[PDB]
Amino acid sequence: DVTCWKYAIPGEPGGELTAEEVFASKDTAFPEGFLWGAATAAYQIEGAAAEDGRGPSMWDTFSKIPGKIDNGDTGDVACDHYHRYKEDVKLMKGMGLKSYRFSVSWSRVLPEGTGAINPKGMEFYQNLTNELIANGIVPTVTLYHWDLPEALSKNGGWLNEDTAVAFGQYADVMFQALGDRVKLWFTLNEPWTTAIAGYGQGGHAPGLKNMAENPYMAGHNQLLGHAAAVKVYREKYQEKQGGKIGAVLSTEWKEPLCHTQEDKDAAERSLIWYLAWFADPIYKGDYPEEMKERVGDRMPAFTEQQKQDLKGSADFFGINHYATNLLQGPTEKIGAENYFSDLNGWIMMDPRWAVGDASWLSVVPWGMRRLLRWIKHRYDDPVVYVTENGLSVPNESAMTPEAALNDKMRVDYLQGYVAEMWKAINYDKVKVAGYYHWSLLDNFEWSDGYKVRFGLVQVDYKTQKRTLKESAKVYKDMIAKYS
Numbered sequence: 001d002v003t004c005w006k007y008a009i010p011g012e013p014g015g016e017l018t019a020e021e022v023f024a025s026k027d028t029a030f031p032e033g034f035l036w037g038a039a040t041a042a043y044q045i046e047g048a049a050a051e052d053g054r055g056p057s058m059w060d061t062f063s064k065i066p067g068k069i070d071n072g073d074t075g076d077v078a079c080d081h082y083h084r085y086k087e088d089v090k091l092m093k094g095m096g097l098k099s100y101r102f103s104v105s106w107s108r109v110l111p112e113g114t115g116a117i118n119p120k121g122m123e124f125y126q127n128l129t130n131e132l133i134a135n136g137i138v139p140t141v142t143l144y145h146w147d148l149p150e151a152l153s154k155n156g157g158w159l160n161e162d163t164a165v166a167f168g169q170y171a172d173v174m175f176q177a178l179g180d181r182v183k184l185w186f187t188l189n190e191p192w193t194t195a196i197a198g199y200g201q202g203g204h205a206p207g208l209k210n211m212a213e214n215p216y217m218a219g220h221n222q223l224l225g226h227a228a229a230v231k232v233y234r235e236k237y238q239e240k241q242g243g244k245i246g247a248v249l250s251t252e253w254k255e256p257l258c259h260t261q262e263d264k265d266a267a268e269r270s271l272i273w274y275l276a277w278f279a280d281p282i283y284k285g286d287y288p289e290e291m292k293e294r295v296g297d298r299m300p301a302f303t304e305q306q307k308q309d310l311k312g313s314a315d316f317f318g319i320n321h322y323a324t325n326l327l328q329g330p331t332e333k334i335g336a337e338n339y340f341s342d343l344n345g346w347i348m349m350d351p352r353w354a355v356g357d358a359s360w361l362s363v364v365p366w367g368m369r370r371l372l373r374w375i376k377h378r379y380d381d382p383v384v385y386v387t388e389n390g391l392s393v394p395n396e397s398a399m400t401p402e403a404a405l406n407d408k409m410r411v412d413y414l415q416g417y418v419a420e421m422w423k424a425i426n427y428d429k430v431k432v433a434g435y436y437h438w439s440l441l442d443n444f445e446w447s448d449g450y451k452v453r454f455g456l457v458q459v460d461y462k463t464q465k466r467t468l469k470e471s472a473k474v475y476k477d478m479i480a481k482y483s
């Protein structure tokens, strides 16, 4: 008499409403001033990797090593956005985007990660910022989106607290240069992924392998980096510039496989290990107690000063979200030994769910609603920005370019997840203030290379031609309708 594979919540307001029904309703509206946007990251789109003074990032180093990137791809050229940024901004104007989320290449501004500003690098981000504002688009900026300067990577990267210090000094430089115009700052993008993929599994730069200790240490120093950047911002810039700052965290929604307390506990535990790992420090001042107790001497301890620096170090909750996982309570005692054994949960997908162009991307729109609601509950009703959400259409690169433009699945993903976001705003009272679709452009999808396509806008990498897909046009109409 144990119910499994049944995710509907009895009595949930709006639970049964389809995306079509949500958008057909005359009463469906979004908050005033809602920031409809799209997101990118510097290494994924800019190119010009070794021109105009840019120093190498650890992803330049990583991508040059045979076997690290699928199909031998690199970010050397990417979408050539460094040269073509004016055209890309005009595309965004045409779509009526309210806002754009981009990242700054740390090593384009500070080639060694510290020291002298590279004038042409700084000038690019000033020019990009001005171009956005001149075209009515609100610029929002990610300071760290994985392109750690190689010089810092060589000195231990996020396993070295020196990197956190350097990050704070870099944030300082960017606030001073752009903060008169940029009023929404994201410190780090997906510290989970940097820690696990970059330092734990080695699938991402810098390619290190240790799941017992490295993820927790890399997470630790990223958090210290966040605290340092926010401290600078609050003390030196915030009163004067009147902007806001926060982190961009990430997780799948974690849904219990069965209606048992064991599976409910396992699902909650995965949310803690993925998201609260970073958010409890930022909102409450320390790691979750259950993580400290489970992980023991493999979890670094914050000093008293660090806890003070971390508590309350966000003005909003940035969240990247794509997918949902089912969680099961293990039936045999799991030993705490490494990140995935520590969280004591068995992870799976419902085979009935559609998937994107990688196995991690399950298409489960209601996960968006449930995660947003979870965030509201745990972190005392913060301002929330959905800072990434999007779809890689399976085998899109093997389609004719013409067929790829008719991206019905991406249309359905956009509509579905936005409708469930709306439910969170309307029924669950989550204070969502913006939504940034991943991505404006097809781009360098890290270790998957260019084969995996997330764009609203198709890029022909041979000619660099941009072409709007169906989803871009649907998104344009959505934004105009709900201003």
Ligand SMILES: [Ca+2]
Binding pocket: 123, 126, 127, 130
């Ligand atoms: Ca200029």
